[PDB]
Structure formats: structure tokens, C-alpha cells
Amino acid sequence: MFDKITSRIQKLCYGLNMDFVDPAQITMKVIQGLYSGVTTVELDTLAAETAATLTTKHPDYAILAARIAVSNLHKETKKVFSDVMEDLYNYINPHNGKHSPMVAKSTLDIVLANKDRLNSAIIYDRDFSYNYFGFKTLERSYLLKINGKVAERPQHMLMRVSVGIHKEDIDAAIETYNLLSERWFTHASPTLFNAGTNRPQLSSCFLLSMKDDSIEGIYDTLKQCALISKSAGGIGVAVSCIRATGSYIAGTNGNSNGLVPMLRVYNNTARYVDQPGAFAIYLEPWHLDIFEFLDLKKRDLFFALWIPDLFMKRVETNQDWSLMCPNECPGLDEVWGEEFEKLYASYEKQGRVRKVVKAQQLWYAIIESQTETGTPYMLYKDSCNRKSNQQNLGTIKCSNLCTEIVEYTSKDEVAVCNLASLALNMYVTSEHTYDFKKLAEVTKVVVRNLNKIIDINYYPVPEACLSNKRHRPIGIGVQGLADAFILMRYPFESAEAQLLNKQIFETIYYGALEASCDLAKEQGPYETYEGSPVSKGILQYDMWNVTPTDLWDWKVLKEKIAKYGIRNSLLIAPMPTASTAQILGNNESIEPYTSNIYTRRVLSGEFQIVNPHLLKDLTERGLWHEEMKNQIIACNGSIQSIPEIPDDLKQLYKTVWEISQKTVLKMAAERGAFIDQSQSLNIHIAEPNYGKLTSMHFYGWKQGLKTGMYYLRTR
Amino acid sequence: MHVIKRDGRQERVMFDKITSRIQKLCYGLNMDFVDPAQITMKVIQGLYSGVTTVELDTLAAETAATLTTKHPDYAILAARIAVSNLHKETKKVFSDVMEDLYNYINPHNGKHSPMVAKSTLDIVLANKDRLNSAIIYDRDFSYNYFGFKTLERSYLLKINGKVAERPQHMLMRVSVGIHKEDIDAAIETYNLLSERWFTHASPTLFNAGTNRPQLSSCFLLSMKDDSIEGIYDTLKQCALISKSAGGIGVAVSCIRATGSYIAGTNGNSNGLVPMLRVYNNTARYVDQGGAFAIYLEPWHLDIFEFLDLKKNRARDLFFALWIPDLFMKRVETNQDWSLMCPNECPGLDEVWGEEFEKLYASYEKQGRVRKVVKAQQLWYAIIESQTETGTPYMLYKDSCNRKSNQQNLGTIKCSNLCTEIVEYTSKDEVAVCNLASLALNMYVTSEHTYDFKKLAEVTKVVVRNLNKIIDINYYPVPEACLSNKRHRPIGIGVQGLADAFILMRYPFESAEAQLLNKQIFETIYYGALEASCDLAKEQGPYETYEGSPVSKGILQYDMWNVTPTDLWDWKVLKEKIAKYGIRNSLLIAPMPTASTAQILGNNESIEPYTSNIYTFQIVNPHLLKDLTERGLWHEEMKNQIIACNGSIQSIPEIPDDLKQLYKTVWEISQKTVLKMAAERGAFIDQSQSLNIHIAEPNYGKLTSMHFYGWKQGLKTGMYYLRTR
Numbered sequence A: 001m002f003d004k005i006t007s008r009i010q011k012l013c014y015g016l017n018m019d020f021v022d023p024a025q026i027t028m029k030v031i032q033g034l035y036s037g038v039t040t041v042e043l044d045t046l047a048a049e050t051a052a053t054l055t056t057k058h059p060d061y062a063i064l065a066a067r068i069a070v071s072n073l074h075k076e077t078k079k080v081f082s083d084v085m086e087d088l089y090n091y092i093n094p095h096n097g098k099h100s101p102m103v104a105k106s107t108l109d110i111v112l113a114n115k116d117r118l119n120s121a122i123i124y125d126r127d128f129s130y131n132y133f134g135f136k137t138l139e140r141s142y143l144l145k146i147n148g149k150v151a152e153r154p155q156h157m158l159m160r161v162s163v164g165i166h167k168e169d170i171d172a173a174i175e176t177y178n179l180l181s182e183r184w185f186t187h188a189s190p191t192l193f194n195a196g197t198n199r200p201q202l203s204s205c206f207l208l209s210m211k212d213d214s215i216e217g218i219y220d221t222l223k224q225c226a227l228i229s230k231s232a233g234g235i236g237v238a239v240s241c242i243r244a245t246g247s248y249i250a251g252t253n254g255n256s257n258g259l260v261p262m263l264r265v266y267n268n269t270a271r272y273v274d275q276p277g278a279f280a281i282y283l284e285p286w287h288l289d290i291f292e293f294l295d296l297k298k299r300d301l302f303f304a305l306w307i308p309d310l311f312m313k314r315v316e317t318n319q320d321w322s323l324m325c326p327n328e329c330p331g332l333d334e335v336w337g338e339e340f341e342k343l344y345a346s347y348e349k350q351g352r353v354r355k356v357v358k359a360q361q362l363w364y365a366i367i368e369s370q371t372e373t374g375t376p377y378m379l380y381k382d383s384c385n386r387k388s389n390q391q392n393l394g395t396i397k398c399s400n401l402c403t404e405i406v407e408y409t410s411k412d413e414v415a416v417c418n419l420a421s422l423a424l425n426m427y428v429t430s431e432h433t434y435d436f437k438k439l440a441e442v443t444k445v446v447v448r449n450l451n452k453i454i455d456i457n458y459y460p461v462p463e464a465c466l467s468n469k470r471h472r473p474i475g476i477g478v479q480g481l482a483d484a485f486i487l488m489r490y491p492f493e494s495a496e497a498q499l500l501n502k503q504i505f506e507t508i509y510y511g512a513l514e515a516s517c518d519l520a521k522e523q524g525p526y527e528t529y530e531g532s533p534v535s536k537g538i539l540q541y542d543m544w545n546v547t548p549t550d551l552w553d554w555k556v557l558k559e560k561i562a563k564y565g566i567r568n569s570l571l572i573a574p575m576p577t578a579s580t581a582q583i584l585g586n587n588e589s590i591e592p593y594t595s596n597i598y599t600r601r602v603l604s605g606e607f608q609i610v611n612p613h614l615l616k617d618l619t620e621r622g623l624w625h626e627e628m629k630n631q632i633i634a635c636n637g638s639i640q641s642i643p644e645i646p647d648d649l650k651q652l653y654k655t656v657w658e659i660s661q662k663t664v665l666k667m668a669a670e671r672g673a674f675i676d677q678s679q680s681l682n683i684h685i686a687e688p689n690y691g692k693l694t695s696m697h698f699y700g701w702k703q704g705l706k707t708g709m710y711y712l713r714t715r
Numbered sequence B: 001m002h003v004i005k006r007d008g009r010q011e012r013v014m015f016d017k018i019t020s021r022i023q024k025l026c027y028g029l030n031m032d033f034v035d036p037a038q039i040t041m042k043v044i045q046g047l048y049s050g051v052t053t054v055e056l057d058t059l060a061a062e063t064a065a066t067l068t069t070k071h072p073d074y075a076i077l078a079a080r081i082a083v084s085n086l087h088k089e090t091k092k093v094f095s096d097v098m099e100d101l102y103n104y105i106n107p108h109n110g111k112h113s114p115m116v117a118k119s120t121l122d123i124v125l126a127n128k129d130r131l132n133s134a135i136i137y138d139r140d141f142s143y144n145y146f147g148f149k150t151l152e153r154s155y156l157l158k159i160n161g162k163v164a165e166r167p168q169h170m171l172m173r174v175s176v177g178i179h180k181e182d183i184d185a186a187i188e189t190y191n192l193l194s195e196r197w198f199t200h201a202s203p204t205l206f207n208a209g210t211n212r213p214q215l216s217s218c219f220l221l222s223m224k225d226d227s228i229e230g231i232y233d234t235l236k237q238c239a240l241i242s243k244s245a246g247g248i249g250v251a252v253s254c255i256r257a258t259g260s261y262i263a264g265t266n267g268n269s270n271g272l273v274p275m276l277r278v279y280n281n282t283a284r285y286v287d288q289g290g291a292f293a294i295y296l297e298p299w300h301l302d303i304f305e306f307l308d309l310k311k312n313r314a315r316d317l318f319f320a321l322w323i324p325d326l327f328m329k330r331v332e333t334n335q336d337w338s339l340m341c342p343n344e345c346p347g348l349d350e351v352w353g354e355e356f357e358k359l360y361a362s363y364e365k366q367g368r369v370r371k372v373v374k375a376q377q378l379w380y381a382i383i384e385s386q387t388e389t390g391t392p393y394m395l396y397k398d399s400c401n402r403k404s405n406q407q408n409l410g411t412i413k414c415s416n417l418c419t420e421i422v423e424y425t426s427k428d429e430v431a432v433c434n435l436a437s438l439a440l441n442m443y444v445t446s447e448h449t450y451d452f453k454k455l456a457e458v459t460k461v462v463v464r465n466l467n468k469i470i471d472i473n474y475y476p477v478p479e480a481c482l483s484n485k486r487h488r489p490i491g492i493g494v495q496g497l498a499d500a501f502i503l504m505r506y507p508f509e510s511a512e513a514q515l516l517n518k519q520i521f522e523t524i525y526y527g528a529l530e531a532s533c534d535l536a537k538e539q540g541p542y543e544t545y546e547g548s549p550v551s552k553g554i555l556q557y558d559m560w561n562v563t564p565t566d567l568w569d570w571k572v573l574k575e576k577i578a579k580y581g582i583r584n585s586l587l588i589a590p591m592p593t594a595s596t597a598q599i600l601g602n603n604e605s606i607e608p609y610t611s612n613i614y615t616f617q618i619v620n621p622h623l624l625k626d627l628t629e630r631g632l633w634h635e636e637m638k639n640q641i642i643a644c645n646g647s648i649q650s651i652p653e654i655p656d657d658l659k660q661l662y663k664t665v666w667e668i669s670q671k672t673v674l675k676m677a678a679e680r681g682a683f684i685d686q687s688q689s690l691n692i693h694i695a696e697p698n699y700g701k702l703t704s705m706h707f708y709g710w711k712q713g714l715k716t717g718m719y720y721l722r723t724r
């Protein structure tokens, strides 16, 4: 009867906390969908939903929820892997009648040719290792469907990616699958979506400079965006070389109307190709159409600024700032620092100025724009260039849609970059220690995937391929930072957390280099290596003037690189890891928990999710009841005012709002010394105020940060 | 009281001096009406001291202008004063003003920026004595005030803000741009221009004999193909043109419809509408510092979105339809209309008429239709759209294709910005065109009879000028340069047809106007065919000639199954074309001549006089020199004409004879407009931009009028619907 369902629910509870996960409580709300002819597939499916609503009661309910839906998926899919593959390949769309492969013949045929090792390498019990929300994320958009019905099991998906990346190298494929299925790391979404497929477009970020300050050039550049965007990529565009409003047009007598009309056109292009889907636009502050730039947005492009140190200096000295038209003052964006500073001052001295403002006016126009919209993003051209390993190639003109990537672009090169994230929580042992070795062992494996990808990647434009091939850059990032601290009982801004911060990143960086180093021993160092800071014997931390903790042996590594080089020009760029973190149940990237309580829509259902680390503490400390959940909510997810919760927990679970943005920044600076490119630093300000903000950029710029601010969050 | 003189000196106000000066330029003006002392009086009315003698000049000229109301010679007298003032303020030797323009240094920037091609200045200077003398600065005095004011605005080359060229100086430079070493030809062409027998289109008058001479203004493109790669090429392509100032038509019918699958990247197509937002946006953006015309075919699934659209910065594109015969035949017989996504039903626009229908039915029987409306539903959308915004334009695909000498390069996919141009375009080719207008009032004599011979002779000169422009023109994209040398087309047209009728004393819809119409256009096709045929004896026929309807002995009128009058001997002309072929694939293309017609004082191209009171606020010169000639016009009579929005039909002391001439376009059968339009259409190898004037338009009106013009065989059966 009622014991029928309840027992069946019992079946899937092994391992869970039985004082909180009570299964008869799921059956109460389910047994009332029992009509004469209720196909038990949908009883089952009801059960998953109910369990997920009780996630608010304990976090292992979420885990039960997943295990039920995964059961259904299992009953619904084929088990044997090569068989799911075959049917994917064989797909014929019945509307057109035309044979549509969904997987490349090249993979399928590697698969069948090595079918026995591969089919058996797969452990389907690992499918039961996501939570409900992580799992529905996959199901939604990651496991391939045939006619609405999902055909891929997550393991099928994982294994497809492994053979995408690794082709006929089997050991290597299986290895990338274990590390993957076991959850030590993950590639970004393009790789996941597209590895194995006929459009194997795997890279994520793309970044451009305007081909020319002419129409030919504008549109030439604009068609590239159009094209890139077709193969769903992040796009950055430096745009500062284009002449400003009122500037003469010699080939008509007309006047240029500036960027505002021009950026519309780009904007329309974002809106037109989607398969919201946005572009990042970069402006340097000496550009005449600066004020209107911080005015379009007060519209599906994101803005950021490529700031010279000079500008910052003038600002805090209450000095004047000059504004120029790039046609009237050329070569400005192909030079930085000392050299920029001289040139600029020299156009300035020749009265080659369009208009002059008190510097601080510009500064406060920006402050205003951030407070309204969170943008423009803040990047320090001088820091980025000064500390690039690609700097031997020219002046770096902008960055990507997210501000983690500092790579060179030109009339004939557009930068690419493929990403992976290591799951930083996975490395804390039960002995309450951080397994550093393992972290370097996974990095090597990851550096080799991103690296193999460069060679098998589908590029939307020749310019991309060309760049990537010449410089082989890779971007490794991390998720679950916040989660790793908590698991080690460390308050985020603790000094224990701060050392672990440094050390994690020494480690990742070390392993990265050491792989790349072995790869230069094999394939040879990349083309533009000779010239680079690292050939000269300088690593990231040297350019920051930092002497790393003795956790590893830098002295020796440097020698290894001295004999062979490195295959890849750059390796390290923490990115927002938006929804890959959501699948591995990790907080998103290098950031603290925004809220200890948040929500998830899953199709048509809404769910209240409490920080799981938090919830596991308070339930087991017998503190958690209805009125508590409500109390927290009323404090926008804070546990600080709740009278009856220990102060070490209060400490452990500060929201980001209650944590110091400065620290956040200092820590970013601390780990920054070990990061090739940059890191996507969102900032969160409480009761924000011009003094409280200004003071905040300057600290970042002073800290030596390539990227000062990504998005800024208000309340 | 005193005047400040040209030297800057004080001179006693002698005002009889002005009167005397007005008279001295009243040659063969009608003094029954023109009155030197009158102007002087109005000018002198409020006179303070120290007012300059340049100041009086303008005030004379601008005062004579406000008296056109009193009699039309005032327009001309007023012009004479103005031309004279200009003359006083500028170097009289042509080749010397030519140097000035070239040796020009920008003051605020420092840099030498020659204002004419050096090749032209060298060429000019090489033949100083000749060319300077060849010019007749007297012809300057022929323009009317407003026309003149026009040129001054935008055609006469300005030095540091001050006008340096004289109307003749401009003219001569134009003729040298066209002719180069060919000094013989350059004086002849100069003479024709200066004597106002024809003009070249603005681009030509603007840019000839200067650096990178963009001299034509017609560009049709086909969408490269159904891909992001294509769309954005064609787009860069349209930017490139707008930069160099084109007017653009765009064939767009091959873009996947809203929802069509995108095989490669999983999701769907957005549709035409989002994509047009891009074009509209580019059209907005690049504007030297005209617009776009977008052609769709009725079977396209995204047709309604298209129509919905303008039908209220959604607009800055003008919409036109490329209409298959089948559609009308469905529309009249109340049938069904299948809408198709071209990705799924490929090639619909690469085929026409008889072959189109066959193909469309093959798709239809197969079930490759995407929705299916009753045909009349569409019609009802097409006219609502027209009722609202006066677009879409109305072109008949298979009428454009069955009657095109370019028939051999394959289906023609669209027309140009203004619907006259019927040229082939493809991936590999953007079709350009160069234009001119024969001004048609010049060819009627004092003996009140039409001088067709002279017409045919001028046409010949123009053909040669047009052809030479192709070869020197500056192409913004290689494909245009590519299309033009292959097919070498040229687009001759006319202005002031209503002026030729009025002067012949023939009322627009009359039987004699009806016939003159046929004949004037017979004449032109004829003379053009000569020049072309002749250039072909000297230069070889054009490259894509063998296979042309004309290389089979088929002239335009033949595709129409019309027989020409016995004005010209056409059998003899064909013999001549059999022997030597022709240089240009197309010749005749009656186009809108907005500005160039306001210059010569002529009415716009082929459209009848649109009223008797234009605007300022003055009366139709032609009617006026008749009215007062018969001593019938008095003071308060402008008021009455205004009181009918320019209709002279109720005023009763005017007799029926004169009422019959001066019918404004709103009391004229549009049906008859179209009948003449087609009738002359038989000698136009390209199309003509027809505008339709319906006062208060209902469905029944527009419907019956589309079908009537269709049934005519028209190619453009409607440019703009002017409606008031």
C-alpha cells in the first residue's frame, strides 16, 4: 500500500543522514497522486520533486532527489555506451528526411575501433554523484537528446568529451574520463557541448582589435564578430582607435558622429546572432567620446575601460585630463606606461587636444555609472601589459567578455582561449588537510587537455587559428574556493585562509608550468616564446616582486624551463565558471557565498536552497527549525543577528557583503602573483558611497591588479 | 545719407542708379509687366545709412523674386541680378578658376587638398586658350532665380566658404571630366549643357573631373547567400557604397524564414526582420557624414512581418515587392497562396514566369509549403500597407524578365532604389548605372511643332557621354566595376514632359499628347540605338552581347508586340545593328530628377504638372504667361487657386481650352497615366519610376489600379503612392 512507495524510496537512501532524511515524509505528499492508472514512472518522477522541496530541511534530501531522477534516467536510457553513440550518429531527422549526425563520424569510429576498453571503462554508479539541481542542469542542456528523449547518460557525455579531446590516445582518454567522472575538474561549457561533435568549436573567449579606423575596417571587424558569435563565443573588442564625434572625414567633407552611432551597429549584431549573447567593449579614457560611453548604458554590449596609470595619477592629484580624437592623435593605443605617458604628454604639449576636463570629473562620472549598472569594468592596461608574458608581441589592447584573459590582438590575430576549472573543494582530505600533490597532478592532466584542444579546435575565423597556433595559450581556473575554506573550517578572511590562498595558487601554477615544460620537451616551445619574459627566466611572481612560500621548488622548475621552454604562453585565468560550478555543487569561482540562502528554478518549480555546509552544521547542532529559515531570509541570507548560533559558525559563514572587499582584493592580489592572465573579480559594496567606492578602486590599482573590477553589486 | 561702395567708400544715395541697372538686364523680358522702378521702390523702402552696395544687390534680387507673383519674368530678372552679383565677385577666366581649385590649401589644417583631379587641371591647362574662349559666360543668364539659387547652394565649388565656380565654369569642368584629351567632344557637350538641352545626374555634376570620381548612382545587390558569411559581406558591400554615396536596391528573398532550422548550430533562424534591423542600422550609421530599397517576393514566409513593419527608426529602408505573374492571377481568381522558406524551396528567385510557376508547383505538390493563406489575404495586407505608408513599391518580376535585353545572364532578382533600373546582379556582380535627363521642353519650336530630329541628335551625344563615364567612373567595390565593363548599361531619361505638352498646347490626357508621348520615346530609343551601334563599330559590341535579344534582332517594342509609328525607319536601323551590334546592354531608364529639374525650371521627369501653385509661394510660369498674355489674370486670383489647392478648374473667366491644359495631377486619370506609361514603356528597355497620385484612396481604387497597370505590361507599376 503506502509502504509500497516508502520502501521503494528507502532503497535509495544508503549513505544519507537518517535523522533528518525521513522517507515517509516524501510519501505523504506523493501517495496523493495515486489515481487508478498512475504509471509509476511519474509516481517516481513526482518523488524526485518532493524530495527536492525538502532540501530546505536537510541537504541530503537534494541528494536523494538526484538519485531518484538518475534512476529514472537509467531505466530510460541504454546502458552500453558505444550503442548510445551509434544512435546519435545514425540520427535521421524525420521532418527533412535528411541524415543528421549528432556526433562526428571520426569519434564514433575511434569509439567502435576501441569499443571494448571504452564501454567497460565507464562506471555508471557515478551518475548518482550530483545533487538534484546539478543534475537537472546537465539533463536540461548537456546530455544529448534524440526527439525530446535524452539519450546520453552523464557518463556517456563525459566519455564523449574524453574521446573528443583525446582521439586515438586511449589511456589518455580513460584518464581524462576518471578525473572527470570523479569530479576533480571540468572543462567549460563549449568543450562539454561540442567535444566529439561535427562543429567541434571548443574555445570560449575570443578577443578582437578594430582592423582599421575606416569603414572597410569597421565592417571587416564586425563580420568577424558575426562569425565568431555563430560558434557561441565570448568576444572582447578594443575600440579606442576609432575617431570621435565631430572629427573630419576627409573622403566626404562630413564629420564622424563617434562611437555611439557605431556601437549601435555592433549592438544589433549581438541581438541578431544567438546560437542574452553579448559583447564586451573596451575604451581607454583619453578618448573624446568617453562621457557618452558612460551614457549609452545609464545596450546588450557590456562596457569596460582600458585604464592607463597616468589617468589614475591625475585623478588622485586633482589634475586636469585631456581628451583626444585618435585620428587627430594616433598610435595612442599601441603603447603603454613610460612610452604612452611620454607620447600622450607630447600630443598634449603640441595642443593636439579636443577638450580638457578636471580629471576627477571623469572619475566621478564612472563612479556614477558603476553605481547604476555595475559597469564599466575596470582594467589597468599598464598592469596588464607590464606583467604579461605575451608583452614581447606588442601592446595588449583590451581583454575578454569577463576580464580574466589578457592576450594580444592585431589586424591579423584574434585571441582565443579554452578553459577548464579544478574543483578546489575535492582536495581537502578528511584529516582536515589540503592535498597539494594531487592538485598539481590534476593540473598537469588539465594543461594537457587544454593544450590538445588548441590543435583540434574548430575556429570560426582564420585570424583566430593563426593566433592560437602561434602562442598556444590556455586558461585554467578554479571553482569552490569558498567551499574549500569552509571544509577546512577556515573563515574566508582568516589568516589560515589567506595562506591556503597563496599556497593553492603556487601549486596550480607550479603544476601548470611543469606540464607545459614537459610539453615543450616533446612538441617544442611555442613560436613567439623566444622574446618572452619566461625565456628570460622571469615567472609571474617575479613581475609582482614576490618570493613564493617554500611549498615547492621553484629554483629547480626554473632550470627545467631553462633547458626546454614551455609549450604554452599563458596558463592561468580564473573565470566565472557560471554553470559548471552549479553541476559540481560548488560555489561559483574564487568568490565567497553571496547568500547563505538562495533559489533555483528547475523548469516550472521554485526551490529554496540553504548553503549546504551551513545546513549540515545547524541541523546536526540541533538548531534548525522553520522559524530559523525565515529569520535568516529576513536578513538577506545572513546568520549574524541570529542570537542562538555559535560565533565560529557566524565567522565561518559570513556572506560576501559582511566580508571585507579590501581583503577580497588583497587576497586577489596575493594569488594574482601566480596568475598568467587575470581573474574575474566581482565586487560587492554594502551601503555604497562615492568615497567608499573610490577608495576601493585605488586600493586595487595600488595592489597591482590587472583586473580591478568585474561587475559591482549594490544591494 | 550714404551708400558704402564696393571699394569701401561713402557715396551719396543715387537710387535711379539701381533702376537703371535693373533695366540694363531686362533683355527681351516683357516690360508690359516687368518694371525696374518698382523693385527699386520696394528695395529702397526701409533704407538706413551705410548699407553696402552688395547688400542692395541681394535685396534687389530677392525682391524681384517676391514679384514672380506679379509676372514670371521676375524669376528670370531676379536671376539675372544674382548671376551678375556672382560675376562681380569671381574670376572670369575658366582655366584660371581651375588652378585655384587645385592649388587649394585648407586654412584650419594646413594640408594641400586639391579640389580637382590633377589629370584634369593638366589637360585643361594644356588647352587654355581654346577652352576659355569656347565658354560663353552669357549663358549664365538663362536660369530662373530658384534654379540658380539651387546650383549656388550645392553645385558651384566653394573656396573657404565663398563660391568660386560660375555655372559655366562648373559645366566646363564636368565636360572635361567626361572627355579628357577629347577636346573636340568636350566643347560640344559643354555647349549642349550650357544651352540646357540635357543634364547629367547630380553625382556626375558633383564629382566629374575630381579625385576618385564617383559619377553614377545606381547599385543593385543580390544577397550573397543564406549564411552569416553572406549577409555580412553584402552588408560591408552596402556600407562601401553609401560611403561613396550610392542609392541602393537589395534583393533579399533568399534568406531563411523565421524558424527555419540552422543545421550546423542546432537552433533556429530569427528571420528577415531582425536582419533588416541591421541594414536599417547601417543605413542610419553611414550617411556621407539616399537610403536602401529592399525587395521581397510574395511567396516568402516572412512576407507579413515585412509588411506589418513600416505600416505604423523601424524605417530608413524602403520596401518594394518583386511580383510574380502567378500571384496576381491567384489574387484575381480568389485562390490559394503558399508561403515558402527558400532554404527548403531553393531557387525560386533564380527563375521566372513560366519556369517559376512549374517550379513552385513542384514544391507545392511535394508539401514543401510552410503555411498557406488565401491569396487575397496578402493583397489586403499589401494595400493596407500602401494606404498607411505609400509603400511597398510594385514591380512585376516576369514582366521585368521577359522584356529585358539582359535576359541571357539569367533571372533578374531586383530593381534599384528608385525602381527604374532593371539589371542583373549575382554573387559575382553588383550592377551600377549612370544617368542623364534630356529636357523635353527645349525641342518644341516657336512654330509650335516638335523637333524630333534634334532630340535624336542630342540623345546620340548623351549615349557617348554616358559610355565614357563607365570607363572612368570610380567603383566602390570590384563587383560593380566588374558588372559595368561586362554589360555596359546606361540609363537615359527625361525631365519636363508636362512642359513639352503645355508648350505644344496639348492637354495631358489628350489624343495628341497621347501620340506625342509615343513618338518622343520612339525618337529617343532610336537615336540612342545609333550612338550605341556606332560606338560598337568603333569599339566592338559589349562582352555579353552574343545571345542578347538584340543580337537576335529583337528590340524592346518587340517583346511588347507593339509596332512603332512610321516616324523612324526601324527596319533600316536593325539592318545596321545586324552588321555592327551595339555597345550597351541597356540605354533608356526614365528616372526621378528632383534636383536637376528644379535647376532647368522643368517639371519632374514624366509626371504631369502637380499643381499650378508651387512653393516663397509662386504661380506656374507657363499658365501665367498665357493668362496675362490673354489679359485675363488679375490680382486676387492666386487666392482663389490656393482655395482649391492649385486647381484652376472653378475660376470661370478662364475658358475650357486653358482649363483642359492646366489640370493638376489630382484631376487626371491615373489609369491614363499608366496607359501612357506603358505605351512609351514599349521603347524603354529598362523601367521608369512611376508615381501614383490618388487623392482619397480606398481599397477598390488601389486594387483595380494595380491590376490595370499589371495588365498593361508595366515593369514598375507603382513607385511612390502620393496621396493627400
Ligand SMILES: Nc1ncnc2c1ncn2[C@@H]1O[C@H](COP(=O)(O)OP(=O)(O)OP(=O)(O)O)[C@@H](O)[C@H]1O
Pocket (backbone or CB within 6 Å): B003, B004, B005, B006, B007, B011, B012, B013, B014, B015, B017, B018, B021, B053, B054, B056, B057
Ligand atoms: N550711389 C548708389 N546708390 C545706390 N546703389 C548703388 C550706388 N552705386 C552703385 N549702386 C549699386 O551697387 C551695385 C554695383 O556695385 P558697385 O559698388 O561696384 O557700383 P558699380 O556697379 O561699380 O557702378 P555704378 O557706380 O556706375 O553703378 C549695383 O546694384 C548698383 O546699382
Ligand SMILES: Cc1cn([C@H]2C[C@H](O)[C@@H](COP(=O)(O)OP(=O)(O)OP(=O)(O)O)O2)c(=O)[nH]c1=O
Pocket (backbone or CB within 6 Å): A213, A214, A215, A216, A218, A242, A243, A248, A249, A250, A251, A252, A254, A255, A256, A257, A258, B243, B285, B286, B287, B288, B289
Ligand atoms: C563614411 C563615414 C565614416 N565614418 C567614420 C568611420 C571611421 O571611424 C572614420 C573614417 O572613415 P573612412 O572610411 O576612413 O573615410 P575615408 O577613408 O574616405 O576618409 P579619411 O581620409 O578621413 O580616412 O569615419 C562616419 O562616422 N560616418 C560616415 O558616414
Ligand SMILES: Cc1cn([C@H]2C[C@H](O)[C@@H](COP(=O)(O)OP(=O)(O)OP(=O)(O)O)O2)c(=O)[nH]c1=O
Pocket (backbone or CB within 6 Å): A230, A272, A273, A274, A275, B226, B227, B228, B229, B255, B256, B261, B262, B263, B264, B265, B268, B269, B270, B271
Ligand atoms: C548563426 C545564425 C544564422 N541565422 C540565419 C542566417 C541564415 O539565414 C541562416 C543560416 O546561417 P548560416 O551561417 O549558413 O548557418 P550555418 O552555416 O551554421 O548552418 P547551415 O549550413 O544549415 O545554414 O540562419 C540566424 O538567423 N541567426 C543566427 O544566429
Ligand SMILES: [Mg+2]
Pocket (backbone or CB within 6 Å): none
Ligand atoms: Mg556699374
Ligand SMILES: [Mg+2]
Pocket (backbone or CB within 6 Å): B226, B227, B228
Ligand atoms: Mg550555412
